[PDB]
Design a protein around this ligand. Structure first.
Ligand SMILES: [Mg+2]
Ligand SMILES: [Mg+2]
Ligand SMILES: [Mg+2]
Ligand SMILES: [Mg+2]
Ligand SMILES: [Mg+2]
Ligand SMILES: [Mg+2]
Ligand SMILES: [Mg+2]
Ligand SMILES: [Mg+2]
Ligand SMILES: [Mg+2]
Ligand SMILES: [Mg+2]
Lengths: 90, 90
């Protein structure tokens, strides 16, 4: 769920050719001849999880610390981004 | 990105074990003994493009149509999601 307007260059003209080609196959609008795509062209991006970052409060040796951890979704590898303390309780 | 609060169950406790284990390797706070992860725990999600949807105004046979096209990022299959018209110029 992210939106934007994109320019109407060659990539967008190729999108219009595909749509007219596909509609000609369906036939519900006769035989159509592609002319051009005009402004505006709106584009939605659908996302998927690449990775994560966690911010923790962690007790260690009865003292409280802040830690940031990063995690890859595919390999599940983790990195310590930050570790400091003692910090006051939240 | 996108942010959320998560529960502090076994997955979050193991996040704290990782952070303390890694900090012990660095050594700046001496030898630390993991106790627990406490509230609150915040989680950020990093996103990658899964696919797209394009909303076009396209001239075909000198008539103006609205068309929506989807596009999968990895397999690159495109699909015609909608095609109607004539529509008034935007
Ligand atoms: Mg914009
Ligand atoms: Mg272009
Ligand atoms: Mg134009
Ligand atoms: Mg996902
Ligand atoms: Mg101890
Ligand atoms: Mg759990
Ligand atoms: Mg608690
Ligand atoms: Mg990407
Ligand atoms: Mg014609
Ligand atoms: Mg198709």
């Amino acid at each position: 769920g992210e939106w934007e307007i994109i320019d109407i260059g060659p990539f967008t003209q190729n999108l219009g050719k595909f749509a007219v080609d596909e509609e000609n196959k369906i036939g519900q609008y006769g035989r159509l001849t592609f002319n051009k795509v005009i402004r505006p062209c709106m584009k939605k991006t659908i996302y998927e999880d690449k990775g994560y970052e966690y911010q923790l409060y962690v007790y260690a040796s009865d003292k409280l610390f802040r830690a940031d951890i990063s995690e890859d979704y595919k390999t599940r590898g983790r990195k310590l981004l930050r570790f400091n303390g003692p910090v006051p309780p939240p």
